[PDB]
Symmetry: C2
Subunit: 305 residues, 2 copies
């Protein structure tokens, strides 16, 4: 029935209001609604990516103890996804930075990851995502941070779970081959690395405009990444993508997903940005029942589900 | 005169970049020599002239120039330099040619020999290897800058400064995090200047008139200043801007005052931007009615 291994949505909210640390739940940030996740599951989605802030989960020093209350909501969100049989992606949505400084210690990052993985180590439907969208930082450091995360996760006995690794240049698919070639060297004793790339369809690829460049821009922008995955014997996932509810973007989205469906030897699937309870009239909202993408884009995603 | 160079970008020939070749007067336009003269009379002595590689040398960068677009580049350079000011020849290309990363240093060197040959006798031309390399291999960026230098000097253009640019959109605030390898560039004329760009809005994109704080500019160039000094190099801010408001005014003068006490490494600064097709642009330095011309230029007069 389904075309891809995974197809689903980001569930954004716990990383909102990032200028306020620790911030206040219900005021600066909010966790996803399990009831609307249930609706997306009924439509055929089977993966939900859950952004959160490292600084809220493990305050002050990333080698320290977790904050019990923010951790409790991360756990509740994750286990509600997995109790339904869907995969939950644990995403420290941190851009390679902690208190807005580049994470320069792989050893500290490895300890952070042992701490996080230890909370989920027996749940095979959890997916660990090393960090969202590394950018503007040393390329060997990005490799070493991803490897430190893998090592920390596996050291906790979390050996059944997939690990989504992310590259530099905001992990963009269109920029992957000439920036992130060194990422092919990552190692995992469980052999469960998936290369997570992001792809937006507006002029600069920022995903801040509802206008897409053209009706073929998604396919165009992931073609070289597809060939890189195949040449290197790797698997990938599109962990964020979106376009506006308009004709050109819808055609680009269909074209991109149809191209991925012809290349499932390397593409494991795709994850829309974004659902979550605090989006309102956001141009990309996948939140049931009234998000614009839930109403107008989901019908073009259903062929893959 | 506080700095070796202080002036403005003269934007327009790179407009309408989706239309190649595009049509002069419709998709793009060259700078107005009369308004350049006005900025010269205010004390500016450097004008950076963006243009598209594909419009100057179409189809293949190893090919022959387009005569019409080249003639207008030449006319613009001469309008600037005949007065005694410096003209920066800026292939405003982001490390890319027909939207693909420039992966051949040899082809890029040939492009640069072609361009430098047109200006080799003019000591007031400055060659800028490429605008704002980004999202590409760090060793390639080094190699492209070196290939440009080699091409320029091979043409006999030996008197001119060469502005080199780094990765991360050549940002000053990101320089030490990504561009350390750029220290190894060599030039037989010993006239390399490291050109960095710095904007003052939250994400550094230079698209908002709001600045983060009254100190954001000086903050964002401190580690780059230290890198230049530690490595025995000289730099220039080749693009900067802020909105016509109190916070940005203060951020601009605080950044320039810091550069002024660090002229062992900083050669000066170049505003973004003047040019004839900006209209009501938040940063327009175009005389007589650009917002920055009216409201920012008065705060820059102490540096002219």
């Amino acid at each position: 029935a389904k075309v891809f291994q995974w197809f689903g949505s980001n569930e954004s909210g716990a990383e909102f209001g990032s200028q306020n640390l620790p911030g206040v739940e219900g005021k600066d940030y909010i966790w996803p609604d399990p009831n609307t996740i249930d609706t997306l599951i009924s439509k055929g989605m089977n993966i939900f990516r859950v952004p959160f802030m490292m600084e809220r989960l493990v305050p002050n020093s990333m080698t320290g103890s977790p904050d019990p209350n923010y951790l409790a909501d991360l756990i509740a969100t994750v286990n509600a996804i997995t109790q339904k049989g869907a995969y939950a992606v644990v995403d420290p949505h941190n851009y390679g930075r902690y208190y807005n400084s580049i994470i320069s210690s792989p050893s500290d990052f490895q300890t952070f990851w042992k701490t996080v993985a230890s909370q989920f180590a027996s749940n095979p439907l959890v997916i660990f995502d090393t960090n969202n969208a590394y950018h503007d930082m040393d390329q060997t450091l990005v490799l070493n941070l991803n490897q430190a995360a893998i090592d920390g996760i596996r050291s906790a006995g979390a050996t059944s779970q997939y690990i989504f690794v992310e590259g530099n240049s905001w992990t963009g698919a269109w920029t992957w081959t000439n920036v992130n070639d060194n990422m092919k060297s990552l190692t995992d004793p469980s052999d469960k690395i998936i290369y997570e790339m992001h792809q937006y369809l507006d002029s600069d690829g920022s995903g801040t405009s509802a206008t897409c460049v053209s009706s073929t821009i998604g396919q165009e922008r992931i073609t070289s990444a597809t060939q890189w995955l195949r040449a290197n014997g790797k698997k990938g996932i599109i962990g964020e993508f979106a376009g506006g509810a308009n004709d050109v973007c819808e055609t680009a989205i269909t074209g991109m997903l149809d191209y991925m469906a012809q290349n499932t030897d390397v593409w494991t699937g795709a994850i829309w940005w974004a659902a979550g309870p605090w989006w309102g009239d956001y141009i990309f909202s996948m939140e049931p029942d009234n998000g614009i993408a839930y109403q107008q884009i989901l019908p073009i995603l259903t062929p893959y589900l």
